Every structure is written in structure tokens, then in C-alpha cells.
Amino acid sequence: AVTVAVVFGSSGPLQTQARTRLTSQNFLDLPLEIQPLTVGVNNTNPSSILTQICGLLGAARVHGIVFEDNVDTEAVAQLLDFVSSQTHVPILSISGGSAVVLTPKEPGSAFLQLGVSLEQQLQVLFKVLEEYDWSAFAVITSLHPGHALFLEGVRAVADASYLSWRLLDVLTLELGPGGPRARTQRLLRQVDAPVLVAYCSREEAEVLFAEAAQAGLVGPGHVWLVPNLALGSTDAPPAAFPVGLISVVTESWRLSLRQKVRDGVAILALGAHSYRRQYGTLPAPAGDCRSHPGPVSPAREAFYRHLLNVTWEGRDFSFSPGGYLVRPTMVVIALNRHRLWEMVGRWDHGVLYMKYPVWPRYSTSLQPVVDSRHLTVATLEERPFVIVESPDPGTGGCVPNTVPCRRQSNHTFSSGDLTPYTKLCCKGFCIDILKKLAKVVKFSYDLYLVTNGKHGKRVRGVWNGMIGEVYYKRADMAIGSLTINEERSEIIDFSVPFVETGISVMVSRS
Amino acid sequence: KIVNIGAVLSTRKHEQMFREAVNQANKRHGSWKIQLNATSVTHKPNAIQMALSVCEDLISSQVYAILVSHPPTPNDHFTPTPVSYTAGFYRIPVLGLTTRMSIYSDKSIHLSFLRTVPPYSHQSSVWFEMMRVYNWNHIILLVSDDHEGRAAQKRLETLLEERESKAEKVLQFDPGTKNVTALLMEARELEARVIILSASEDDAATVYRAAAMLNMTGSGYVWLVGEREISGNALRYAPDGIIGLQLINGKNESAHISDAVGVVAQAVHELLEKENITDPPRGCVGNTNIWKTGPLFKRVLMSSKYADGVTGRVEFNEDGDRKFANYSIMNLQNRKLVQVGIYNGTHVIPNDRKIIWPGGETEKPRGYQMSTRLKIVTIHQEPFVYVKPTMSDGTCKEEFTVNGDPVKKVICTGPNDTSPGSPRHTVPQCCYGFCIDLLIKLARTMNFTYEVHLVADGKFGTQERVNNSNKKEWNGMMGELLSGQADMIVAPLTINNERAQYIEFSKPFKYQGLTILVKKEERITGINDPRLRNPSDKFIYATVKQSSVDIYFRRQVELSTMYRHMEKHNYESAAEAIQAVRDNKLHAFIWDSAVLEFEASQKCDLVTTGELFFRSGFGIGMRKDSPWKQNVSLSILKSHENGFMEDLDKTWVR
Numbered sequence A: 001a002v003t004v005a006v007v008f009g010s011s012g013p014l015q016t017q018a019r020t021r022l023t024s025q026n027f028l029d030l031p032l033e034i035q036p037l038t039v040g041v042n043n044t045n046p047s048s049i050l051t052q053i054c055g056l057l058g059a060a061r062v063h064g065i066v067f068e069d070n071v072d073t074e075a076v077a078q079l080l081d082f083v084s085s086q087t088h089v090p091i092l093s094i095s096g097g098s099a100v101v102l103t104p105k106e107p108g109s110a111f112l113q114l115g116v117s118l119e120q121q122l123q124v125l126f127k128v129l130e131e132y133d134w135s136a137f138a139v140i141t142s143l144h145p146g147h148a149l150f151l152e153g154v155r156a157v158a159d160a161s162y163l164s165w166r167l168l169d170v171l172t173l174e175l176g177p178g179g180p181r182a183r184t185q186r187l188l189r190q191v192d193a194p195v196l197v198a199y200c201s202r203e204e205a206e207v208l209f210a211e212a213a214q215a216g217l218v219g220p221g222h223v224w225l226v227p228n229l230a231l232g233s234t235d236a237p238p239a240a241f242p243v244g245l246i247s248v249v250t251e252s253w254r255l256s257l258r259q260k261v262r263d264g265v266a267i268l269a270l271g272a273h274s275y276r277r278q279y280g281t282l283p284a285p286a287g288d289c290r291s292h293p294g295p296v297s298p299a300r301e302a303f304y305r306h307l308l309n310v311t312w313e314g315r316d317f318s319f320s321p322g323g324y325l326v327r328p329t330m331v332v333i334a335l336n337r338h339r340l341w342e343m344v345g346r347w348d349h350g351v352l353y354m355k356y357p358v359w360p361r362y363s364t365s366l367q368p369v370v371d372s373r374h375l376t377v378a379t380l381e382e383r384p385f386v387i388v389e390s391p392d393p394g395t396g397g398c399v400p401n402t403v404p405c406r407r408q409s410n411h412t413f414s415s416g417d418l419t420p421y422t423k424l425c426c427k428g429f430c431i432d433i434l435k436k437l438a439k440v441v442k443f444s445y446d447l448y449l450v451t452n453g454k455h456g457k458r459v460r461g462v463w464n465g466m467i468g469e470v471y472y473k474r475a476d477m478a479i480g481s482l483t484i485n486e487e488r489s490e491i492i493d494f495s496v497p498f499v500e501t502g503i504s505v506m507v508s509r510s
Numbered sequence B: 001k002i003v004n005i006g007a008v009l010s011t012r013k014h015e016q017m018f019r020e021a022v023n024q025a026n027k028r029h030g031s032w033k034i035q036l037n038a039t040s041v042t043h044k045p046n047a048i049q050m051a052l053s054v055c056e057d058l059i060s061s062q063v064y065a066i067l068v069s070h071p072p073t074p075n076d077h078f079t080p081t082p083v084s085y086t087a088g089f090y091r092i093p094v095l096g097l098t099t100r101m102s103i104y105s106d107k108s109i110h111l112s113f114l115r116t117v118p119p120y121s122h123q124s125s126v127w128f129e130m131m132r133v134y135n136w137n138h139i140i141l142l143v144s145d146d147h148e149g150r151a152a153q154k155r156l157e158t159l160l161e162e163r164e165s166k167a168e169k170v171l172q173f174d175p176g177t178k179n180v181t182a183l184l185m186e187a188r189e190l191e192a193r194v195i196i197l198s199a200s201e202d203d204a205a206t207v208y209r210a211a212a213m214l215n216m217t218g219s220g221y222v223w224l225v226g227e228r229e230i231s232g233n234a235l236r237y238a239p240d241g242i243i244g245l246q247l248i249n250g251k252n253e254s255a256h257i258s259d260a261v262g263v264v265a266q267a268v269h270e271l272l273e274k275e276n277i278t279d280p281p282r283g284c285v286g287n288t289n290i291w292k293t294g295p296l297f298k299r300v301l302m303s304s305k306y307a308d309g310v311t312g313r314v315e316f317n318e319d320g321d322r323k324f325a326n327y328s329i330m331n332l333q334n335r336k337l338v339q340v341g342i343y344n345g346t347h348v349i350p351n352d353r354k355i356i357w358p359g360g361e362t363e364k365p366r367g368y369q370m371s372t373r374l375k376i377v378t379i380h381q382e383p384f385v386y387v388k389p390t391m392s393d394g395t396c397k398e399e400f401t402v403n404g405d406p407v408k409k410v411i412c413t414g415p416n417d418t419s420p421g422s423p424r425h426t427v428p429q430c431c432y433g434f435c436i437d438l439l440i441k442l443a444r445t446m447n448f449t450y451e452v453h454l455v456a457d458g459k460f461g462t463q464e465r466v467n468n469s470n471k472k473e474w475n476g477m478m479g480e481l482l483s484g485q486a487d488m489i490v491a492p493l494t495i496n497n498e499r500a501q502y503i504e505f506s507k508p509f510k511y512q513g514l515t516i517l518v519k520k521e522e523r524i525t526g527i528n529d530p531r532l533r534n535p536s537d538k539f540i541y542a543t544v545k546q547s548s549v550d551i552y553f554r555r556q557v558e559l560s561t562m563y564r565h566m567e568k569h570n571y572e573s574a575a576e577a578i579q580a581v582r583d584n585k586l587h588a589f590i591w592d593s594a595v596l597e598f599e600a601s602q603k604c605d606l607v608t609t610g611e612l613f614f615r616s617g618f619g620i621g622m623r624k625d626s627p628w629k630q631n632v633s634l635s636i637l638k639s640h641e642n643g644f645m646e647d648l649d650k651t652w653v654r
Ligand SMILES: *[C@@H]1O[C@H](CO)[C@@H](O[C@@H]2O[C@H](CO)[C@@H](O[C@H]3O[C@H](CO)[C@@H](O)[C@H](O)[C@@H]3O)[C@H](O)[C@H]2NC(C)=O)[C@H](O)[C@H]1NC(C)=O
Pocket: A452, A453, A454
């Protein structure tokens, strides 16, 4: 039996404490049924927090400690770093606040924040930007600390980025109490960019969004992309937050607090029981309320040598040497036009799965806006011209000179409710000519493969294929090995043919 | 309207002077209702109770600032760090005046920390002028693995990048650990003379004693550190002639207290006349919110240009640290620490004496020592490189040309056969041939010795995001050169723009092209056959991995499909591919014109087809910015003038 500490630090109602304490002993599903002792600080201050910590340190032989916090505090992470450095104690963080990742850590610390590094979030968001291939983007930050590291990170990613990713403008602004609007609000008014990437705090984001709405830089044709620090309280997004905001978080965002606590306890217990397997011994207890013994424990080193590569219930909860997580699964979340946060994509194992082949740019009055230039493109598979294949599995996505394409949804039963959409690599003669058309006429496009049959024929008096998708307004334009005939011509318009063909009789030479 | 200031000192006596210091403020500025007051404590070895008292005594009181100093026991960042955390919870400023740790320079973790002494990393900027003063270009960096060392390394990297220059290499080490003499050895076979170091006192002493074991104390070699590395045991093991930087104040805690009190009083008066100062949280317990005017007080502290300090102008930098600081240049002469100059900005000023260099000389040594023994790396290529096993006696066979002269052969070391199939025995073997002949000629022309050793992997190489990595990294001889294993390449290497960014190609020494080889009926249509354009299972073809042709087929995306064919059957060397084509395991091989025509004129039974779809040169490559490029360029020019390379070809191609 291992004794652990479940620390509550998000204030809130006091009903949380007992409603978690009775379930603390209800963890029988996990090996070596844990003896968790929980405590909750209703004041959330360094003195009381340290008092509880040191009291539980002197209370009994505890091995691992987990802590939860409210979504708008930062110093508690550093306080627990001090605890785990001075006392050499393994700890874990959950919920808002402490889960924020601090790239520098004291060498003697073992606090091991449970979150995602900022640069990894940048990697995910630039991959998403590649999905909608918006090479033009503007960098907008405030004078909030860490923005130097943020600009270093964006410089590093853009430097490691493949395409000539246009940094339209890198700029820093003043946010907080009031602030000078002169040459800063006018600076906003002179900023000209359709895609913006931001970095600031939660209330800084609240103020900046209000200014941007007051700046006139809001609405369709203006997209924002912000990190986790800017966002907060996904349940309660303020009115200042514009619709169509994008970020990426952990899958546990939607889980309940009890589930998060149980998962943290499970990870701790699995590390402990892996130690128990390999070395046949229970984990070495932690330090004391008073001063520290000195050097690191070799058994604590064993816990830090089997802890970093732990998994539980399908999820590999691996950690980075920087006291945070490495390549976990992430959910790309997006604020909708209903002022609600839902799932727009998923980044897992270096793979992006989005439910939106195109980005919906809803306008101010809660209505979608359709671009004139962007246009739905439909086709049928054909080896000489319409080459379809699986996306490159080694690196994800598609190779160059190839377009991402999709099946004709699954509208026979799934009219667009299947969020994992099977991407395909579409390349060929028709792909090349449509690429040239796009690069000349300067219009976007949306490609998807048609499934309901073949080219198209009036069946039972109604048409099908690309002919159906276009004549019945389900699509805009169709391309492929399409022959022009009158029966095809009365109901739909054709351009001038580009490559001539005809009927032919094929035979064996011998 | 009452004000109070918190102090955490170590002497327990300056505290009383601190009591005077606030009085000094009340004696330097008006009293009125400002009610300038003082509060002081001494930190404890156990920081828990220290922070608890800080809450129950300072935050609980009307304290608007906190200062801290260093304890007599050497622990540094051990003591003040929890304070930096505590202040962060309430955004109150904290002033640490006796710390050289760059960790405190962070604003993300230490929100409201300030220092009037720049950290050890800022010392880098100091030495930045050294090389500028004495015109030193070849600079070698050696740094500990500690974060302070990493910060100093990146700071000096930025500085040297400002002049669009670079250190020729940087090396890292662990603190107080075991074998370090490998680094000092590779420093011996390095090029530079002037060395710069950064470590702890015990670490510096270990480096000193190891370098003394390795004769690094001799003339020409120069070392450069701060004041940490020249104390105690490190000072004892530091040889004479070492140059160091000294703080003008160093340990005058009284001057630091006076200047801090003055600037604090000035900032407090400015805040009071700017009003809306709110109040301290009045206790850690209970009050859980942040202090709103904390950022405002921090920014006015940033702009607090209190120039009336005892140390002169107390000017904060961008990060809130002392800017245009004062230091002195000291030279260790005959066990005496002698000063030679002063530093306060963009220009060191000499004051007295002369620099007694570590080798005991009086003249300023140059920054490098050109090594007349260069490094030769290559790959075995029969048209250009012949490699044979030496006899039991370990020499080359007395094999003479048809004209009767012996072939000039050397002893190139390296693995006995390819590493996966080999037991990884770096067996020296006889090697000779065209490239060998020309390198011997140009060496006789420049009169320099050399060392011959073929490439480890056997592949040419390219930038690649290798497994478990992120940055595209070279391999092959380009990687071996960029690492410094070899200093210049001698091989029928192809010039490409990708290599051009990293390896200095001289003028081409030979011209050649790219073509296709088959056996002995569908004469292949060069690079215009559809049967290439749409790959077939009946026709199998490939090239060498990490090679120039791979780069070419990668650039032309229109050819990418054949590149997709490449990754199926790509070979690793010319011999196996040639035999397989002779065995019809492969159908056609894309490679150099010269290689294919050579084997055809010697082996027969196989023919090249199609024209030289890509013409280029084989040019002798070498390291960037090394002086020898112009010499070898004009040498190969004059060799083309008298046709000596043509004579070489007639010796090797009949
Ligand atoms: C393409 O040509 C096909 C043959 O000329 C023909 O498709 C066939 O259409 C019939 C429609 O009656 C399908 O039969 C379906 O309905 C019967 C009952 O009426 C069921 O018993 C069957 O199981 C089936 O559900 C055929 O299955 C279908 N054949 C194929 C191969 O699809 C249409 O003229 C054209 N069809 C399409 C899809 O383009």
C-alpha cells in the first residue's frame, strides 16, 4: 500500500474535497490499491500551501503527490518547483494554472509539469495552417514575459518550416491597465493581414480582442491563432472572444476533474509499480517537513528512469526531460459561432485529422460567408488522368505536386458527421491543369472524389455522377475524362474542350 | 502615506546602517507624511521558515520593496530564490545585489527581480572587446554543462554573430567530473591559440591542472575567464599570465545598500507623485490576489535613472540590470594579481604595465597556428581511387607503370570492408590513383604534409532529418569535415548548390557528365524515355543513396516518380551495382560519365547510352574561409595550363 497526496488548490466549493476523498479509496481497479490522503487549501496562498505541504511531509511516509489548481494562477508552479527542489519530492500538476509548462527547471526538481511545450503547440498550429496553406501570417504579442522566448520559438519553427512561410509582421504591444492607445490602436488600424498569430495572457487577450473589434480588424478575412496561455475557462468564454478562434489542448480538457485526478493517480501508481516489478521494492518514501537530506536518491532516480516512458489505458503519458510531456495526443479546439468551444481537429502521432475540409468564415451576424474565388471541385477516378492514392504514411499528408482530396463524404448514411475524413493524395493531368487554372485565375478550390457511380447519366429521369453533383447544385465545377455530348449539354454548360478524343475500337495486334 | 522597506542581509551590522540608510533617504529627501521607514531580517539556512517569516513580517506589513544579499557561506542562488518566488505571488519588486547567476536574469520565472551586478554571462560581452582590441579571429569556446554556462555561451554567440563572425568551435563539459583531457587533446590538434573558459572554481582548477598535464600553458595559447575561476584552488592552479576581470565593488555591500536605498527612495517618491499606489496585500494568508500596481512600480524601477549612486550612475539595462558597468582587467604575473586596464563600455582603457602572456613572452600572440599536416578523406573509386591491402610487412607493393615508373601510393587507414559487413577494423591499406596523384602534386606545390583516411560510412551524404531528430544533418565526408575529422576533401565530388552553402568548392579540376549504363534491343532514351517516366517492374534502375544524383532527382519534382523508384533499389557503392547490372539484377544505372566510360574502356561488355543529361565538374572542395582555397585554385589553373592533369589522365585513362 502506497500513500499519496491529492492536493486541491482551485478553491471552489468545499463539496469537492469530500466527493473526491471518498473516491480516493475507490481506486481498486489499479494495482496495489493506493492509500490517498487529500487536502484542499481554500485560500490558495504560498504560506498556507507550504504549511499543508510541510505538514503532510511530516505526517507519514508519502511517495508521490498530485496537485490541482485554478486556471488563472502561475506562482504556485514555481512554489511547487521550490518544494520539489528543496525536498527532492516527485510531484505532478493537473487542472488550470500549474499545468502551464515552464521551460527552465531547477536540476534538483522533480515537479514534472503535466502540460505541453509552447514550441510543440507551434508545430501543431503551423501544421494546421499548412492544412489551409495560409503562408501569410502576422505575429502579434504583448510585453508579457516569455514573449522573447515565444518570438524565439516562432523564429525557430519558421526557420525549420518547409515553405517560405510569410512572416507579415512581428510586433509587440502594451497591454494591462489602460495603456497608450496612440500609435498602438492606430498601429492596429495600420496592420494589414488576413491571418494573425498571437501570444499574451488571458485578460490581455480579453483586452486585445476588444481592441481588435474596435480596431475593425475582425470578421471574415481575419483569422486568429493563439496559444494555451491566452485561452482559459473553455466552459466560460467571454463576450470579448471573437467567433472562430483556434488553439490546441489536451484531450483531457473535456474530462471531469475526478477523471483527471484518477488518471494522475494511475500514472503515479504505474510508475511506482513498474519500480516494484523491476526492483521488487516499494518506492522510497519522500523527505521531511524540515531540511533536506542531500543528494538525489538512487531509488528516486529509478522512479525518474522508469517514469518518463509510462502509458495507461491506450494513452502514452510520456514526459520530456524538461519536466513536461513529449509527443502526446492533442485536440485542436475551435471556438464556434455559437460562442462554444468544440473539436475541429486532432493531432496524434504526427497526423492531422480535421472534420472541416474548408474553413468556415462566419460573419458578424451569425451567418456563414462563402468566398467567390473558392470553389467546389468534383471528379471521378481514372488512371491516365485522375490518380488517387493513400497519403504518405511516412511523413503524413501528401507529397508535393499532389492535392489533398476526399471521398464524396459518406452522404449515403453519413452526410458529413464522420469527423475523421479519409485524406487521399490526388495527382494527375487534370490535377495539373486545375493547378494552372488556380494559379492563373487566382481562385481557391475544394477537391473531393465523387462516389455515387460514374461520370453521370440520366437514371430514371434524374442524373448522377459529376453531372448530378453540379446540375443539382451539390457542386460547382467538374473535371476529368468528360466527353461533351448533347444529352450532357442541355442541362449543364461546358467550356471549350482542351484535349480531343473520340470513340475507338481496340484490338489485339496478334 | 507611510512607506516601509524590507531587507534580508547577512552581516546583522549593515542592517543598522540600513536603518541609517532609510534615515539617509529621510535625510536626502523630505519627510512630510511620506514616513520613510525601515525593516530588516537575516535569512536562515532553511528557506521554508525564511519565506514564512517574509510573509508574516513583510507582506503583512506596509512593505513596498525587498532587498537581499549573499550569505558568508558560498551557496549563492540557494538563498534568494524562494524570495524571488514569494514576490512573484504578489508582484512586489525584489532587489538581489550579490548574485552572478543568469537564472535570476529570467523574467518569466523571476518576475520582479533586479540586480545592480550583471551576471557571469554578461562577462561574455566584456571579452567580446578583447579579440576586437588585439585583432583575434580564431576563438575557441569551452563551457560547462550548467545552465549559467549555456546562457553565457548563447550570449557570446549572439555577440560574435553581431560582427557576422563565428567561433570555429564550441565544446561542453561536466562539472568536477572524470576524464576531460580528451577535450584538451582535441584542442591541441585544433587551430586556434586564444582560448576562453567558463566554469566553477573547482572546475577551473581541474581544467588548469589537466591543461598543465597537457602542456597547454605554453606560449601562444591564451585563456580568459571571469573572477570566479581565479580564486582559491583555481587561483593556485592558475598559471601566471592569465587575464581576468574584476568587479570595481565586488563585495562592498555598503555601497550596494546605499545605491539601492537611493534608487528605491527615488522610485517611491516618483510613484507617490504619480499616486494610486494601492497597498501591499497585508499578509500571505487570506489575501490571495496579485498587486495591481506591481507592473507599474517595476516599469518605473526600469526607468529609475538614479545617477546619484556611490558607484556612479545606476543605469538599468533592458532587463533591469546594471548597464555600462565598471570592471578592471587583471594579469596574474609571478603569482601577483596585477591590473592593466579598466572597462566601462564600448572600449577598454589600458592604465599601466604590459601583458605578460602565459608562455612567459611579452609579445601578443596571433590567434591561430596553421598545421602543415592536413587531413585527406575520400571514398574508394576505381577510376580515381585504387585501394589494395598492404603486405604482411605493412608497405605498398613495388608496382611500376607501363613506362616503368612506380605508382605513387600512400597508406590510407580505415575500416576493412563496409562497416555492417565488416568487424569495424580500421586497417590501413595501400591507396593510389588519379586524385592521389593530383593531391601529391599540389602538396609538393604548397609543401605541406597530410594524413589520408577514407570516409567512415562510405556514402557521400546530405542534410537529412535522421531518425529521432529534427534538423537535417549532413553525413559522409561533408559531415566529417564540418565536425573537423577531416579538413579538406579530395575525391571526384560533384559540385551542387546544396553543398555550396556549407563547403567551399574551388574551381573545377575535371569536367564530366551524368549518363546511363546497360549491358551488351530498346536503346534507352536517356532521360526522355517514358519507360523511365512511368516506372515498370520489368525495368529496374537506381542510384547511390545520399549522393549527388539523389539530390538532383530530389530537386526536379517532375522527376519525383523516378525518385520514388530510386528508394526501391538504391545501391550503396559502385561495385555491387556494376556487378548486378553485369548480372542483370539491375537493368540500367545512372552515374558519372567518366566512371562509366572508364569501366567500359576497361571492362567492356557494357555500354553507356544517352547524352550527358547533366554536365558538371569534379572540383576539389575544402573547408569554408580557410586561406588555401586561392592557392589550390591557381594551382589547378596552372596545372591546366601545362596540361599536367591531361598527363595524369593519360597515365590513368588509356
Ligand atoms: C451502371 O451500370 C450498371 C449495369 O448496367 C447499373 O448498375 C446496377 O443498377 C441496378 C439497379 O437496379 C443495381 O441493382 C440493385 O437493385 C436490385 C433490385 O432492383 C438489387 O437486387 C441489387 O442487389 C442492387 O441493389 C445493380 O446492383 C447495379 N450494378 C452495379 C454493378 O452497380 C447502372 O446502369 C449503373 N450503376 C451505377 C452505380 O452507375
